[PDB]
Structure formats: structure tokens, C-alpha cells
Amino acid sequence: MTGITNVTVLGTGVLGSQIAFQTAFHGFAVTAYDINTDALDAAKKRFEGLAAVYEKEVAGAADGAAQKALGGIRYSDDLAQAVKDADLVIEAVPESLDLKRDIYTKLGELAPAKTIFATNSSTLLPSDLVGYTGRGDKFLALHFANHVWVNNTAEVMGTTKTDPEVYQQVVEFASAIGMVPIELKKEKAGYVLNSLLVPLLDAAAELLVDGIADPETIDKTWRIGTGAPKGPFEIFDIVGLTTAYNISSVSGPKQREFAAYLKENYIDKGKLGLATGEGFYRY
Amino acid sequence: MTGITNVTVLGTGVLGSQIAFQTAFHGFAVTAYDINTDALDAAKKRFEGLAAVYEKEVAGAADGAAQKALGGIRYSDDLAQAVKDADLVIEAVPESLDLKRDIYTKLGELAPAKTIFATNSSTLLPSDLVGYTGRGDKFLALHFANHVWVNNTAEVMGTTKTDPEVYQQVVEFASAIGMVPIELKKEKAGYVLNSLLVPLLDAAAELLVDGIADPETIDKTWRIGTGAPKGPFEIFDIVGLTTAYNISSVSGPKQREFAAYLKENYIDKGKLGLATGEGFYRY
Ligand SMILES: NC(=O)c1ccc[n+]([C@@H]2O[C@H](COP(=O)([O-])OP(=O)(O)OC[C@H]3O[C@@H](n4cnc5c(N)ncnc54)[C@H](O)[C@@H]3O)[C@@H](O)[C@H]2O)c1
Numbered sequence: 001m002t003g004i005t006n007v008t009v010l011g012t013g014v015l016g017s018q019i020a021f022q023t024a025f026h027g028f029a030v031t032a033y034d035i036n037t038d039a040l041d042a043a044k045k046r047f048e049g050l051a052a053v054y055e056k057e058v059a060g061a062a063d064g065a066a067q068k069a070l071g072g073i074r075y076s077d078d079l080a081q082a083v084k085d086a087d088l089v090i091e092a093v094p095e096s097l098d099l100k101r102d103i104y105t106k107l108g109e110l111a112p113a114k115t116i117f118a119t120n121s122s123t124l125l126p127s128d129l130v131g132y133t134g135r136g137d138k139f140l141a142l143h144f145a146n147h148v149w150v151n152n153t154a155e156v157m158g159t160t161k162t163d164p165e166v167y168q169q170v171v172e173f174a175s176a177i178g179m180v181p182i183e184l185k186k187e188k189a190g191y192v193l194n195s196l197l198v199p200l201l202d203a204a205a206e207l208l209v210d211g212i213a214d215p216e217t218i219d220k221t222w223r224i225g226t227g228a229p230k231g232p233f234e235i236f237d238i239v240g241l242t243t244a245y246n247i248s249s250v251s252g253p254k255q256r257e258f259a260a261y262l263k264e265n266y267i268d269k270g271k272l273g274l275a276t277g278e279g280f281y282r283y
Numbered sequence: 284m285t286g287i288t289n290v291t292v293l294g295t296g297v298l299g300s301q302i303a304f305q306t307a308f309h310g311f312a313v314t315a316y317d318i319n320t321d322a323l324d325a326a327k328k329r330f331e332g333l334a335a336v337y338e339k340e341v342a343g344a345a346d347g348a349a350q351k352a353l354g355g356i357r358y359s360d361d362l363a364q365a366v367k368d369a370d371l372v373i374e375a376v377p378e379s380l381d382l383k384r385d386i387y388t389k390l391g392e393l394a395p396a397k398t399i400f401a402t403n404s405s406t407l408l409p410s411d412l413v414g415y416t417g418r419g420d421k422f423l424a425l426h427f428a429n430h431v432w433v434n435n436t437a438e439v440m441g442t443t444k445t446d447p448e449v450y451q452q453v454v455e456f457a458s459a460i461g462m463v464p465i466e467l468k469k470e471k472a473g474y475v476l477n478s479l480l481v482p483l484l485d486a487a488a489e490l491l492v493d494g495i496a497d498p499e500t501i502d503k504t505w506r507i508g509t510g511a512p513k514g515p516f517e518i519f520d521i522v523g524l525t526t527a528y529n530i531s532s533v534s535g536p537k538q539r540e541f542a543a544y545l546k547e548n549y550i551d552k553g554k555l556g557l558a559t560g561e562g563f564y565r566y
């Protein structure tokens with residue numbers, strides 16, 4: 001008769017907690033899973049943080065609505081119990097092939113037949129994981145963006161093996177929790193958004209490193225030329241220069257030249273971007 | 284005592300006429316140069332078109348101000364006479380190495396010593412031209428965008444040989460005619476704007492060709508993810524699919540795959556973008 005009602009999220013970190021909370025906020029029955037009681041205690045702290053954020057930032061969260069969502073969440077550190085009646089499992093464990101491999105094999109065994117599996121992985125492709133799951137027709141990617149309550153896209157990307165009626169029901173779940181479903185047709189590293197954004201940021205980095213123009217110039221050129229609200233380097237500051245450095249340092253020669261540039265001129269000086277109050281720009 | 288007053292523009296085509304007119308509109312003494320009286324007649328028609336546009340679209344152009352600028356422009360099809368008292372020459376002849384080569388050698392000989400030379404070339408690098416000029420310390424690029432009155436950037440890009448006091452005076456001329464100077468430090472193919480934009484559009488094209496996602500999806504992902512007003516394919520429509528095809532067809536394998544895609548699905552059907560009323564989107 002009915003579809004997705006019970007959702008279990010694996011991991012209560014930065015994205016796990018946001019995913020779980022947004023889902024609870026939209027009336028699903030949520031279980032947050034993590035490794036031990038200390039991780040669960042820390043999860044609860046995040047959920048209380050999110051609740052506060054929602055009551056100030058999110059439509060409909062005022063006057064106790066965010067607290068009620070908070071209070072309704074269940075915590076579990078026993079995977080078997082955590083997914084026992086799960087309609088959907090959203091996996092946001094650390095970005096580690098080994099650690100996700102471990103997770104899915106167990107999850108494939110412990111979760112009832114009905115359960116749809118969805119990974120939030122940034123870099124690990126579903127195909128890289130579909131094996132360990134044991135239910136490829138029910139395994140796909142549901143990829144969120146940090147600050148899901150306002151950057152509310154959910155990229156839906158399955159494998160060739162993925163069942164279309166499952167894919168569609170994930171899409172509809174995404175709408176149910178207030179996301180804009182971004183539907184990919186074939187698997188793709190970086191889904192859509194990162195696929196578009198990285199090339200822009202790389203081109204900007206090259207201009208800076210090769211001494212063609214300063215950040216301000218590059219940024220105003222982009223805002224004026226495309227009408228965008230923020231230029232590449234303003235975007236770097238939002239992404240965070242530590243993240244930008246990590247990514248830059250594992251790519252072609254030119255990017256690595258940028259990573260070294262970030263390290264010397266920003267990272268080493270403690271100018272990590274927006275969150276810390278100064279990166280390419282002072283805030 | 285005084286600086287740039289007399290400006291001669293070589294070519295009265297799409298960008299030559301806009302450059303000349305904006306410059307006349309801001310009080311410089313402008314001579315428009317073209318090859319014969321028939322080209323000059325057509326120049327006059329464009330200038331009258333621009334005058335109409337300015338009176339409806341441009342601050343300060345109403346109540347005869349745009350007509351007065353129009354009336355003050357001089358036409359010449361004799362290069363010697365055209366640049367005889369020129370402080371600045373802006374070159375917007377066809378994008379043709381041979382045709383610009385011809386131009387600069389003559390111009391180097393005919394223009395008084397004081398004259399600064401500036402090319403509006405998109406693809407031809409200044410260094411590719413500095414030779415034929417004979418005044419490398421007074422030769423640089425001043426690159427405009429189509430619809431200069433509203434897309435009012437002017438990318439200033441010189442050669443290693445370029446004289447810094449000349450570069451700065453071009454920058455100040457750019458401000459004088461209401462442009463936002465985009466100052467490049469070293470030469471770069473595509474200056475700043477195209478350098479940033481092409482990679483974004485290419486990444487979008489790849490997603491479309493490889494069947495990862497449809498235009499709408501890719502566009503909404505970009506607008507939502509970056510807050511930009513327009514997605515890649517809306518931008519393609521603005522650029523014009525004929526232009527996009529030309530550029531796509533002379534680049535790496537993946538782009539060529541896109542060019543063929545444009546040709547089959549849009550060009551061959553007469554869907555050329557915004558100007559004709561339909562491209563990726565119907566307008
Ligand atoms: N952080 C982002 O901006 C972002 C964006 C999109 C997708 N993602 C993806 O989400 C996942 C990373 O999550 P995050 O960085 O947002 O939070 P995080 O990495 O800070 O937290 C990881 C969560 O998993 C828990 N955990 C640790 N070991 C575990 C295990 N052995 N089994 C089950 N849980 C375990 C941690 O305690 C924590 O609750 C990766 O797939 C990453 O690619 C992150």
C-alpha cells in the first residue's frame with residue numbers, strides 16, 4: 001500500500017545529521033545510526049544545533065516545530081536494530097572505500113528485502129559499491145549539498161543495474177523532504193554540480209597562478225560577464241580553502257601549482273576562507 | 284599637455300560600430316574608417332541604429348544627446364587621412380591574420396609617432412601582431428564585448444613589449460568611455476572572461492552529449508548551486524548556437540561531439556538561439 005516511511009541514516013556527521021534532520025522535519029520516521037554511544041551523544045548535539053538553525057532559518061520550523069522533529073528522532077548503534085523496519089537507508093559514512101565496503105556487505109545482510117539503499121558519497125561511484133550491497137536494483141546515489149535546508153538539491157544518480165521504479169521513488173522522496181531532485185541518467189563522477197563548478201574554479205586558479213590577473217579582477221569579470229552574484233574566488237572562500245587545497249593537490253600539474261599557491265599564501269597564514277573570517281577576501 | 288582626444292576606429296562592423304559610437308557618445312572626436320564608400324554607407328546605418336538603441340537604453344542619451352554623438356562622427360576610406368591626427372586607433376577589422384597583418388604594417392607607417400594602437404581581436408594574440416605594427420611599446424589589446432553599452436567590460440591585455448604608461452592611459456580611456464577596465468598582466472588567449480566561460484560551457488556540453496542529464500536539469504543545477512541568473516544552456520542561447528558550433532568544431536574530440544550535436548539537433552532545424560527566438564529554449 002504505502003511507500004517510504006521509515007528512514008535510517010548511517011552516520012551523523014556533517015551531512016548525516018543534516019540529512020536525518022531535514023527528513024525528520026518533513027514527517028518521516030527517522031533513525032540515526034552511528035558506531036557507539038559517544039558518537040550518538042555527539043549526533044544529538046548536532047541535531048540540537050540544527051533545530052536551533054531551523055527555527056531561525058527554515059519555513060515552518062518556528063514555535064516548537066523544529067524541537068518536535070528533534071524529539072522524534074531515534075538513535076541506534078546496532079545496525080541490525082537500526083534498519084530492521086527501514087524503507088530507505090541513506091548512507092553518509094566517511095569517504096573511505098574500505099569503510100563503505102564493510103558497511104554495505106553487512107547492510108545487505110541485515111536490512112529487510114524491501115529496503116532501498118542510497119549513498120551520499122561525493123567521490124566513490126555507486127558502481128564502486130553496488131557489488132558489496134547485494135541489491136543493485138535498490139542501490140543508487142542520493143547526493144546532498146552542505147546546508148541542505150537552503151542549498152536544497154538532491155542529485156539522484158543510479159547504476160545501470162538500478163531499478164527505475166526505485167529511482168523514481170527516491171526522486172519523490174527527495175521532493176517530500178523539500179529537495180529539488182536533480183535527476184542524472186547515467187553515472188558520472190561529481191554528478192552535475194561539481195562537474196560544472198570544478199572547471200570554472202580551475203580556469204580561475206590558472207589565471208591567478210600564471211599571473212594573468214588578480215582575484216578581484218577575475219571575480220568582477222565573472223559577475224559582470226555572466227551576471228552571477230559571486231566570482232570564482234568568492235566561491236573558493238565559501239567552499240573553504242582547505243577543501244580547495246585537498247582537491248587541487250590531487251589533480252593535474254596546473255592545479256597542483258594552485259594548491260601550493262593556496263598553501264603558501266593562505267593556508268599557512270590561517271586564511272581559510274569564509275568560515276574563519278578571511279580567505280581571498282576579508283569578511 | 285593633453286592626452287587621448289582623437290580616436291579612429293578601423294572597421295565599422297558589429298564591434299567597430301559599437302566601439303566608435305560609445306566613444307563618440309562620451310565626447311571623443313571619432314573617425315570611423317572602412318574600405319570604401321559602400322562600407323561607409325553601411326556604417327552610417329549602424330550608427331543610426333545604435334543612436335536609436337542609446338536613446339532608449341543608455342543613461343544620458345535621451346533628448347538629442349545620442350543624435351548629437353551620431354552627427355559628430357567622421358567617416359573615412361583613406362587610412363592615411365583617417366589616422367593623420369589620431370591619438371588612439373582601435374582596430375576591429377575581420378578576424379584574419381592576413382588582413383590584420385596588412386592593416387598594421389600600413390598603419391605603422393601612416394600614423395603619427397604619438398598614436399597608440401589597440402586591437403579588439405578575440406583570437407589573434409597581440410604578440411601575433413606586434414611585429415607588423417612597428418611600435419610595440421604602443422601596441423596592446425583593448426577587447427570589448429558585444430553590446431558594449433550594457434556589457435561594458437574592456438579587457439586590457441598588452442605584450443611584454445608594451446609600454447606601461449601607454450597601458451595605463453588605455454585603461455583610463457576605457458573608464459572615460461564608461462567601460463569597466465579588466466586589466467590583464469600577461470598575455471592570455473581568451474583574456475579573462477572567455478577563459479572562465481568556455482570551460483563551464485564545455486563541461487555542460489559534455490554532460491548533455493554523454494547523456495548524463497538534459498539542458499533544464501543542468502541549468503537549474505547551476506542556478507541553484509551558484510545562485511547564477513542563467514544556466515549554461517541559457518548562456519548558449521545568448522551566445523548563439525552558430526557561434527557555439529564554430530568554436531566547438533575546432534576543439535578536442537568531446538567538443539566536436541557537441542558541435543555535431545548542435546548541428547543535428549538545432550542548427551539544421553533553424554533553432555539558433557535567442558536572436559532567432561529559439562535554441563535550447565523557446566523564447
Ligand atoms: N561534507 C560534505 O560537504 C559532503 C557533501 C556531499 C557529500 N558528502 C559525503 O558524505 C559522506 C561524508 O559525511 P560528512 O563528511 O558530511 O560527515 P562526517 O564525515 O563528518 O561524519 C561521518 C559520520 O560517519 C560516522 N562513522 C564513522 N565511522 C563509521 C563507520 N565505521 N560506520 C558507520 N558510521 C561511521 C562518523 O561518526 C560520523 O557520524 C561521504 O560520502 C562524503 O563524500 C559530504
Ligand SMILES: NC(=O)c1ccc[n+]([C@@H]2O[C@H](COP(=O)([O-])OP(=O)(O)OC[C@H]3O[C@@H](n4cnc5c(N)ncnc54)[C@H](O)[C@@H]3O)[C@@H](O)[C@H]2O)c1
Nearest residue numbers: 294295296297298299322375376377378403404405427429
Ligand atoms: N563580434 C564579436 O562578438 C566580437 C567580440 C569581441 C571582439 N571581436 C573582434 O572584432 C573583430 C571583428 O569585428 P566584428 O565581427 O565585431 O565586426 P565585423 O567583422 O562584422 O566587421 C568587420 C569590419 O571591418 C571591415 N573591413 C573589412 N575588410 C577590411 C579591411 N580590409 N580593412 C579594414 N576594414 C575592413 C568590415 O567592412 C567591417 O566594417 C575581430 O577582431 C573580432 O575578434 C568581435
